[PDB]
A paper describes a structure:
2′,3′-cyclic nucleotide 3′-phosphodiesterase (CNPase) comprises 4% of total myelin protein in the central nervous system (CNS), being the most abundant CNS non-compact myelin protein4. CNPase consists of an N-terminal polynucleotide kinase-like domain10, a catalytic phosphodiesterase domain11, and a membrane-anchored C-terminal tail, which contains a cysteine residue that undergoes isoprenylation. The catalytic domain enables the rapid hydrolysis of nucleoside 2′,3′-cyclic phosphates to nucleoside 2′-phosphates. The CNPase catalytic site, lying in a groove between two lobes, has pseudo two-fold symmetry and contains two apposing His-X-Thr-X (X denotes a hydrophobic residue) motifs, characteristic for 2H phosphoesterases 113537.
Additionally, we characterized the perdeuterated CNPase catalytic domain (dCNPcat) and determined its crystal structure at 1.04-Å resolution, allowing the observation of active site protonation states and dynamics, as well as water networks. Comparing the measured mass of dCNPcat in D2O (25976.0 Da) with the theoretical mass of 100% perdeuterated protein (26012.1 Da), the perdeuteration degree of dCNPcat was very high (97.9%). As the thin crystals of dCNPcat could not be grown to dimensions suitable for neutron diffraction, the structure was solved using X-ray crystallography and refined to an atomic resolution of 1.04 Å. This is by far the highest resolution obtained for CNPase so far. The proposed catalytic mechanism for CNPase involves two histidine residues in the active site; His309 deprotonates and activates the nucleophilic water molecule, and His230 coordinates the leaving group and protonates it upon completion of the reaction. Examination of the electron density maps for these residues confirms that in the apo state, His309 is deprotonated and His230 protonated. The chain of 4 water molecules at the bottom of the active site is coupled to another group of 4 water molecules above them – representing a true apo active site, without any bound buffer components. The outcome of a more detailed analysis is surprising; out of the 4 water molecules at the bottom, the central ones have 5 coordination contacts, while both of the distal ones only have 4, in a classical tetrahedral setting. Anisotropic B factor refinement and alternative conformations reveal directional disorder in the vicinity of the catalytic cavity, for example concerning a number of aromatic residues. In the case of dCNPcat, the most drastic geometric outlier is Trp289, which is sandwiched through C-H…π interactions between Pro290 and Gly305.
Residue numbers in the entry: 162 to 378
């Protein structure tokens, strides 16, 4: 029997991966120095940290090696639920190796993860899986809302958490967030969502080039 990839997704080109990685790092630096973030630090960490400055680049140390990616379907070589159905789809086979542009609308941080929110085109949405275990933070969010690029994770967090963290952030702002920004960073408006959750809504969306394919460990 033929096994499947570990996961399907869009793998950023080297240059797009470097552009987004650098924007993520700049965000972490700017956020950690922002007055609003600093005065909410005890909502973010929970230990015996001193009354000194947290460097978010250190905090989010488990950064992807190599290129960045946006996962569609985690397959675990066929062991994940829904893997075989996903992979057999015409659209997946037709798209395999195709180039796409991914639109990044926002960067976000929680105490667990840092990531970029991806807003998929209608063509890209056809590659989004139709799975069976709906996260409660996805209630009243449209399919494909979880799409993201992981930028870093805290030490004991697994990268999958980044999509759950995005969904939870999106739940906070689903009714609209006009007038609610706590402040601004150079590239957009900064939102403080409580419980260590922060979102930079980009003034101008970023656009990265990627290729749809399957990754094998
Ligand atoms: Cl979703």
């Amino acid at each position: 029997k033929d096994f499947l990839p570990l996961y399907f997704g869009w793998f950023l080109t080297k240059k797009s991966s470097e552009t987004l990685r650098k924007a993520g790092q700049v965000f972490l630096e700017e956020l950690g120095n922002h007055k609003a973030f600093k005065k909410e630090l005890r909502h973010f960490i929970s230990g015996d940290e001193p009354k000194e400055k947290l460097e978010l680049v250190s905090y989010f140390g488990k950064r992807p090696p190599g290129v960045l990616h946006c996962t569609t379907k985690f397959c675990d070589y066929g062991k994940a639920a829904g893997a075989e159905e996903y992979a057999q789809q015409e659209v997946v086979k037709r798209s395999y190796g195709k180039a796409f542009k991914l639109s990044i609308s926002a960067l976000f941080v929680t105490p667990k993860t840092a990531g970029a929110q991806v807003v998929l085109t209608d063509q890209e949405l056809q590659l989004w899986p139709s799975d069976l275990d709906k996260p409660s933070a996805s209630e009243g969010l449209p399919p494909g809302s979880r799409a993201h690029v992981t930028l870093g994770c805290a030490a004991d967090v697994q990268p999958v958490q980044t999509g759950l963290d995005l969904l939870d952030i999106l739940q906070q702002v689903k009714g609209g967030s006009q007038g609610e920004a706590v402040g601004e960073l150079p590239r957009g408006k900064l939102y403080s969502l409580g419980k260590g959750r922060w979102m930079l809504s980009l003034t101008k969306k970023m656009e990265v080039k990627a290729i749809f394919t399957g990754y094998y460990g």
